[PDB]
């Protein structure tokens, strides 16, 4: 039962329990082997186990399609280290090594338990006979498609080779199919389900966006006589939630330009919020000192471009403020999400200005056209624009900010708990929008 999974989880993978109860649910569902499955969890969160552990228990071969060799290699190497009968088929292999593997799979009892293949080979006429014999001889326990989103033109990583995978899934009729990715909008999820020919009911395990402890709000810079003061007050309120620790935690302010970073750090510092600018314009030495002081809590606020990265994670970020609207909802989600990792209350705020909206909308269109002269027209170009439009919608609409985010990503309506501006005071937001409408001209 569940017992076999736990033991094989320890006896092979050396783990007491699954990272999450969701990862557990996903794995168990793949184990039952009745349903096609879709896993949309982030990088980390242990998606691989969701198909690897069940691949072992299966009494047959698991094929795994992955788009490039780096991804394949990481795991095969690690599966070997667990004394697990894994193999890779790719054209970066010698013709004889290939011939040898193909022969293995043709044998009544093949060595291979897990075969990683590229989409190219999986479609190739040179591999269909092998695949046919595995199907005929009922030796195939799972078809797995990693980076499933690559099938979608509305995705950011489209690969025509992935379109052929659908016809293939149909051929491997009996056997369950598992599709995995870190990132799919509802439109991408639809393209995956359809283009991979997943058999309904498709069982879905998707890590929710929602974070209780983050308080989201938007302010309109055009409706504010002291913007710098508004920001100061915001940073101070976010810091010093515990008079016991005095001024407690740290904060990020994001700006589009390096000039804005420099200038805004001054405005804040002068008003009594100690802030230093971080951008690629600074000398390496300067950057390492600013980062250090922020990390070591000598300087509570960093004013940064997108150059500040998930590479540095800090638990006690009490606020992220976007002085300028982000290029994309996914960017805003990622950037604002640097807040509150320790679980304690934090504040995410976006400073919206139609002058900003237009400045960015222009910048995107200009560097999309720069691509169209180089590579020509593409469906990804339209998704780039759609990605920004979602965030403009997020600002200029009224409704739970967390729900708007859940909707974009394809999550359930989340449990807001007066945890965004709109849910706390729907009226103020209405008033503020109305106000921006008068200030429209």
């Amino acid at each position, epitope marked *: 039962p569940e017992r076999r999974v736990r033991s094989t989880l320890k006896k092979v993978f050396g783990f007491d329990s699954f990272k999450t109860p969701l990862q557990e649910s996903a794995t168990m569902a793949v184990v039952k082997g009745n349903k096609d499955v879709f896993v949309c969890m982030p990088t980390g969160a242990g998606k691989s186990l969701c198909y690897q552990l069940p691949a072992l228990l299966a009494k047959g071969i698991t094929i795994v399609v992955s788009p490039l060799i780096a991804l394949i290699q990481d795991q095969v190497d690690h599966l070997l280290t667990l004394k697990v009968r894994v193999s890779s088929l790719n054209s970066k292999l010698s013709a004889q090594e290939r011939k040898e593997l193909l022969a293995d799979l043709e044998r009544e009892k093949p060595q291979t338990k897990i075969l990683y293949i590229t989409p190219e080979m999986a479609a190739s006429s040179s591999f269909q006979p092998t695949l046919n014999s595995l199907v005929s001889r009922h030796l195939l326990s799972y078809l797995v498609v990693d980076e499933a989103h690559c099938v979608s033109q509305w995705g950011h990583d489209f690969r025509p080779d992935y379109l052929r995978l659908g016809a293939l899934r149909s051929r491997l009729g009996h056997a369950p199919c598992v599709a995995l990715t870190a990132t799919a909008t509802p439109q991408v999820q639809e393209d995956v389900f359809a283009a991979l020919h997943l058999k*309904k009911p498709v069982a879905i395990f998707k890590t929710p966006c929602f974070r209780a402890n983050l308080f989201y709000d938007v302010q309109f810079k055009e409706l504010i006589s002291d913007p710098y003061g508004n920001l100061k007050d915001f940073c101070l309120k976010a810091l010093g939630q515990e008079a016991d620790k005095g001024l407690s935690g740290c904060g990020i302010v994001y700006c589009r330009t390096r000039e804005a970073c420099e200038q805004l750090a001054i405005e804040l510092s002068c008003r009594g919020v100690n802030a230093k600018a971080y951008h690629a314009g600074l000398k390496a030495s300067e950057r390492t000192l600013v980062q250090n002081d922020w990390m070591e809590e000598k300087v509570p606020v960093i004013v940064a471009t997108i150059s500040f990265g998930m590479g540095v994670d800090k638990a006690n970020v009490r606020f992220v403020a976007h002085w300028n609207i982000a290029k994309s909802m996914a960017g805003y989600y990622q950037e604002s999400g640097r807040a509150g990792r320790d679980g304690k209350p934090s504040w995410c705020r976006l400073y919206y200005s139609r002058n900003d909206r237009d400045q960015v909308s222009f910048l995107i269109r200009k560097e999309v056209a720069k691509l169209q002269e180089k590579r020509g027209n593409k469906a990804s170009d339209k998704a780039t624009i759609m990605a920004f439009d979602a965030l403009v919608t997020f600002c200029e609409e009224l409704g739970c900010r967390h729900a708007a985010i859940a909707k974009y990503f*394809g999550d359930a309506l989340p449990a807001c708990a007066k945890g965004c501006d709109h849910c706390q005071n729907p009226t103020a937001v209405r008033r503020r929008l109305e106000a921006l409408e008068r200030s429209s001209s």
Partner: nanobody
Framework: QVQLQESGGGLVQAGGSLRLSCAAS????????MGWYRQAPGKQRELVAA???????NYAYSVKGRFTISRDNAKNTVYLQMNSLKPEDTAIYYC???????????????????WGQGTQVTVSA
């Protein structure tokens, strides 16, 4: 899993008007297409009309101009306004919630088609 209830099917005079309302309930994030199918007795089931998320409609030739499909995306409800009914329109009418995306506040979801039990429409001349 989802609950579809069709309603508003009844015996009608020739030239009568019938409205068929089906409500989809569950943790429904979205429905690709809500559609009305009908099955006359000892005849094979046929598409009467369907409407996508986005409002693209699609109708059988014989009901074009007499029948109007419409949807309330937020209530997950589809309607079929049947006008100028004929005896040939007599059948059991089924509603198909096609591509129905379900999701808990945990990441646990499903994607499936759902069908109703059907509602009898009889048209007397």
């Amino acid at each position: 899993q989802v609950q579809l209830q069709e309603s508003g099917g009844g015996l009608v005079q020739a030239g009568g008007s019938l409205r068929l309302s089906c409500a989809a309930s569950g943790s429904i994030f979205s429905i690709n297409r809500m559609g009305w199918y009908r099955q006359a007795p000892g005849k094979q089931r046929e598409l009467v009309a369907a409407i996508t998320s986005g409002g693209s409609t699609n109708y059988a030739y014989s009901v074009k101009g007499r029948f109007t499909i419409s949807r309330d995306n937020a209530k997950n409800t589809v309607y079929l306004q049947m006008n100028s009914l004929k005896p040939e329109d007599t059948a059991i009418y089924y509603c198909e919630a096609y591509g129905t995306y379900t999701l808990a506040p945990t990441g646990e979801g499903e994607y499936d088609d759902y069908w109703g039990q059907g509602t009898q429409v009889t048209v007397s001349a």
